[PDB]
Amino acid sequence: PVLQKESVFQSGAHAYRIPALLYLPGQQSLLAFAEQRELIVLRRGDYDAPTHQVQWQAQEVVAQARLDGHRSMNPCPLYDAQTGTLFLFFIAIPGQVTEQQQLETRANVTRLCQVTSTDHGRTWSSPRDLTDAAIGPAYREWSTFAVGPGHCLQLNDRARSLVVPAYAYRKLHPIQRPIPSAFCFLSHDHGRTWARGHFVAQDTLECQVAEVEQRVVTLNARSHLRARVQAQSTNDGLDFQESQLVKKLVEPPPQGCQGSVISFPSPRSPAQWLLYTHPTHSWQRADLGAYLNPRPPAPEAWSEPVLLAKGSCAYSDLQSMGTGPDGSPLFGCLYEANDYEEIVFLMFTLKQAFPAEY
């Protein structure tokens, strides 16, 4: 049972993909982002407590989130609890082959960008190209890269550091095709300066990060194997301990699929629990499921999944939304469905999803 299920983006031409969701705690509202085949679009929605429904407003293009002559992709939003400022990180790639690419097929021409808002996402700043400052000399060592997709992370450390999940196709071989590896971008000063963390295992792509109780950053990545890949860091994402396979979280080979993970206050030793969404079919992108980890980020502690939606489902993004009407944690989930013909918003509580916990 759920509180709300609504298609917030629809296109028979598969125009909308790559969902990103952001919850604003003071406003008690959601920002739902998506790529529109390319620019980034957004729908704002307030949680109407009296009816316990999110009232989605009209779709609008995030005009500022783009570079002239470039396609924008991978919306990666974050709310800075210290300043209240919102960050929308995104990727920008030339719409057409550049002269440089004409001579160097694998030349990196991808840009890391951001737009910020100081009015709860109503208006955005001019885009800021973070590429050189965040990646540095390693830039030429990759063919391309991306952040997210989906929400990023803000730690509960003294600095309230920003952690942006990412992955890059490394041109390690001149003949072999570039292989992707996940990593994190880290800032302790609200995005003024950035550090590029070390890569986790090879062949890891779209990943998301969460912080759990010392405090560690857990990175959960898409793989080309039959299970998810996870790794934890004790230094805010700069370095990760050996990557591990999470057999309890299935990945459909050979392509795998993007999934989402968030932490939330334990509803009961550990301070936080993790909630994760991803398709549950052994080899198809179908049957979106929600999984719980009560002793994060231990791979063997993941629960069996509960079905959130049957049928075709792909990428998703989660956000905790405070406390639900029944008294248990409230969650919002944005996911691709029906052969990429729509992006659906699902709102449910922990009690609804995992009744055994109550």
Choose one: 27-35, 92-100, 132-140, 306-314; the region binding Cl ion (CB under 5 A). 27-35
Q: Which is nearer to Cl ion, 27 or 131 (CB)?
A: 27
Q: How far is the CB of 325 from Cl ion (least distance, A)?
A: 17
Neighbour count for residue 6 (Cβ, 10 Å):
12
Nearer to Cl ion, 331 or 335 (CB): 331
Per CB under 5 A, the segment of 22-30, 97-105, 277-285, 301-309 that binds Cl ion is 22-30
Q: Which residue is nearest to Cl ion (CB)?
A: 26
**Binding span for Cl ion by CB under 5 A among 17-25, 90-98, 147-155, 323-331:** 17-25
Q: Which residues of 172-187 are buried (b: 16+ CB within 10 A; e: fewer)?
A: eeeeeebbbbbbbbbb
By CB under 5 A, residue 86 contacts Cl ion: no
Q: Does 265 bind Cl ion (CB under 5 A)?
A: no
* φ/ψ (deg, to 5) at 280: -110, 0
Phi, psi angle pair for 139, to nearest 5°: -45, -45
26 touches Cl ion (CB under 5 A) = yes
- The reply to whether 207 sits near Cl ion by the rule CB under 5 A is no
Residue number with CB closer to Cl ion (22 or 205): 22
Q: Among 6-14, 24-32, 102-110, 284-292, which window interacts with Cl ion (CB under 5 A)? A: 24-32
* 3-state SS string for 153-215: EECCCCCCCEEEEEEEEECCCCCCCCEEEEEEEEECCCCCCCEECCCCCECEEEEEEEEECCC
- Which of 25, 69, 325, 327: binder of Cl ion (CB under 5 A)? 25
Q: Distance between CA atoms of 263 and 156, rounded to whole angstroms?
A: 12
Residue 24 interacts with Cl ion (CB under 5 A)? yes
Size of the site for Cl ion (CB under 5 A): 4
Q: Which of 211, 315, 335, 342 is catalytic?
A: 315
Task: Tell me: does residue 136 bind Cl ion (CB under 5 A).
Answer: no
CB contact at 8 A, 71 and 92:
yes
Active site residue 342: no
Residue 28 is a binding residue for Cl ion (CB under 5 A):
no
Question: Does 304 appear as a known binding residue?
Answer: no
Catalytic residue among 35, 211, 336, 342: 336
* 346 touches 5 (CB < 8 A): yes
- CA-to-CA distance for 9 and 317, rounded, in angstroms? 14
Looking at residue 101, its amino acid is Q
352 in helix, strand or coil?
helix
Q: Which residue type is seen at 116?
A: T
- Name the strand (E) or helix (H) holding 103: helix 99-103
| CA-angle at 331, arms to 327 and 334, nearest 5° | 160
226 is in an annotated binding site: no
The answer to whether 37 is a known ligand-binding residue is: yes
CB of 85 to Cl ion, least distance (A): 10
CA distances from 202 to 73, 112, 178, 182, 327 (A): 23, 21, 11, 8, 42
Query: Residue 285 annotated as binding?
Result: yes
Sequence-distant (≥ 6) Cβ neighbours of residue 306 within 8 angstroms: 289, 290, 291, 353, 354
Q: Which two tokens stand for residue 262?
A: 């968030």
Catalytic-residue membership of 315: yes
Q: What angle do CA 61, 66, 72 make, to 5 degrees?
A: 85
Residue 345 near residue 26 (C-beta atoms within 8 A):
no
6 versus 119: smaller Cβ distance to Cl ion? 119
Q: 312: which 2 tokens?
A: 């075709």
Position 262 contacts Cl ion (CB under 5 A): no
Report, in Å, the least distance between residue 128 CB and Cl ion.
22
Least distance in angstroms from the C-beta of 247 to Cl ion: 31
Question: Please, what is the minimum distance in Å from the beta carbon of residue 244 to Cl ion?
Answer: 29
Residue 82 CB, nearest approach to Cl ion (Å): 12
Residue numbers in the known binding site for substrate are: 17, 37, 167, 169, 206, 222, 285
| Chain residues that interact with Cl ion, rule: CB under 5 A | 24-27
Mark the binding-site residues, compressed into ranges: 17, 37, 167, 169, 206, 222, 285
**Catalytic annotation, residues:** 315, 336
